[PDB]
Design a protein around this ligand. Structure first.
Ligand SMILES: Nc1ccn([C@@H]2O[C@H](COP(=O)(O)O)[C@@H](O)[C@H]2O)c(=O)n1
Ligand SMILES: Nc1ccn([C@@H]2O[C@H](COP(=O)(O)O)[C@@H](O)[C@H]2O)c(=O)n1
Lengths: 310, 309
């Protein structure tokens, strides 16, 4: 119920789906179908709570007018375009280069927060947003004697340009979602229901397109849907659903910058946990990135009188 | 130089590329490795051919298009095979697909008799089957395995294509043996022709893939080295190595020695995965090994040793 508990919980669970994905990714299923099931989980859990809210509550705010309902399409259109850009990018860059260009969403959300959401940021705060992006990048940077030597700056221009466009779309999606939640006095569960309906539709249309690409002659998406699905596979479907509901909560009762701080701190926690479990070699880059990020946290969230005291 | 040392070495190295693949499958494209692996074999064969011509008084080499053009066929089969493999996986989970893979043992068996016209005793036929049964046994999904593959409950297309896949797989191998043994030619010249067409077709595949997206995205040659770790290069060499041994066996041995090596590699991988990846040893592993060890004895044991005390 407090934004900082939800944000902390999102951090805990964003790193859970991180580890559970790799474990489940032990050589058996389709990660094309999970986002569909993950959306279906969110759509049906939101609908449940909407139903329960209508039967429990004297008044439930719900804008049924197509003027406002149709606007929940946009995020899905952005995310569709985003997925094409992501796929396009990876045909110029190795996934590590792509993973590290991903920290640009922190600055692009920053900018669109100001531009689209028209919200005010101090200079100290702007410097924190940048520090966060720099701090996360720092932890990811390829250390000495790393077998996949990514020759820096030596990737094709298309790669760099698309990586940048990817981050702008990623940010735009999140920032537009916040707009939708906060533009209405409506119920969180009704906003979710509309949002995640269009997501289900578009996820589904994607899989139908994929089947169209092979002339519908091969196996259809609905038949294949459950193939290889272990328990761990189902854990991440729920886990991806869970975190997605928290993101919506924060889109309503918080902001994108709290989101990207949660997401960023999850990525650091994952690396810290990977040392004890997957036994990954701890590096100075991890150490440094954490300190930058902890300080980036304080800068942005610390009350401005605490910044100035002894 | 002795077939049984090469076969044993192929077993050792077929399981090496097995582990090294998963370890490296930790950043790259497994679409491009077969291309580099073929290039390695083509250029290592060419090297030894060159060296053989400069070292040897006489080198047997049939340059006539009548016989050179026949080295295309394996590549055409393997191309069709890869389409079938991809098609299959859109009806079945990879485990179901992996376990249907033991049918290549019986399909090589049959085509050995049909295409290569070679003679098998009944004891030998029973060994070929036992091998396929023994490998399947080790793979079978044990109690409390999270991906519960509802047996027999897959689509018909899946089962039918899995079967067709095995026939093509076998046909490719059996036809290769035909090519090696139909000539008195140099191993290195047979490799050079074989692996030239393989390079060409591997390359045409990647060009097709780029055509499928209108050549608008990243081209295969630019992308070729992306994500390539040292580990990645180890399996490229390792996949090249084993492939040269397969050719040796296509010439101076037979497909059945191949599939015994491949099968025993798959068992060794599971045994090694217990100490390294710490996979839980099962009775199915234990049973499959005993079946396979006995399947080995049956096929290779001299028939007087089978009958003594
Ligand atoms: N694999 C995926 C995953 C998501 N998407 C897009 O993202 C949207 C789903 O929303 P989220 O995944 O952001 O919850 C869909 O509208 C879909 O177009 C996709 O096109 N391919
Ligand atoms: N990923 C792969 C690997 C091989 N192949 C096919 O297999 C042939 C290469 O032979 P090997 O890789 O079996 O030595 C090529 O002609 C190619 O058409 C493919 O089409 N896609």
């Amino acid at each position: 119920m407090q934004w900082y508990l939800v944000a902390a919980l999102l951090t805990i669970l964003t790193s859970s789906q991180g580890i559970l994905t790799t474990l489940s990714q032990s050589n058996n299923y389709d990660y094309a179908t999970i986002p569909f099931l993950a959306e279906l989980f969110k759509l049906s859990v939101s609908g449940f709570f909407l139903w329960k809210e209508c039967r429990t509550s004297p008044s439930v705010r719900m804008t049924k007018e197509w003027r406002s309902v149709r606007l929940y399409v946009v995020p899905s259109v952005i995310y569709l375009i985003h997925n094409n850009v992501q796929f396009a990018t990876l045909t110029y860059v190795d996934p590590s280069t792509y993973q590290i260009m991903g920290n640009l969403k922190i600055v692009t959300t920053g900018i669109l927060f100001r531009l689209v959401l028209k919200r005010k940021l101090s200079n100290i705060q702007w410097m924190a947003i940048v520090l966060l992006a720099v701090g996360t990048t720092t932890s990811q940077v390829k250390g000495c004697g790393d077998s996949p030597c990514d020759s820096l700056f030596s990737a094709p221009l298309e790669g760099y340009l698309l990586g940048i466009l990817s981050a702008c779309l990623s940010a735009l999606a999140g920032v537009y979602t916040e707009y939708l939640m906060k533009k209405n006095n409506d119920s969180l569960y009704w906003q979710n229901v509309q949002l995640y309906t269009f997501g289900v539709i578009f996820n589904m249309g994607w899989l139908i397109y994929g089947d169209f690409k092979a002339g519908f002659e091969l196996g259809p998406w609905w038949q294949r849907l459950f193939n290889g699905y272990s328990i761990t596979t189902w854990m991440v479907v729920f886990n991806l659903g869970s975190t997605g509901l928290l993101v919506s909560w924060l889109m309503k009762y918080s902001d994108n910058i709290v989101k990207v701080y949660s997401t960023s701190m999850a990525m650091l926690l994952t690396m810290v946990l990977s040392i004890y479990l997957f036994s990954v070699k701890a590096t100075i880059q991890l150490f440094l990135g954490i300190i930058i990020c902890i300080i980036s946290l304080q800068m942005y969230f610390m009350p401005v009188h605490m910044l100035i005291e002894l």
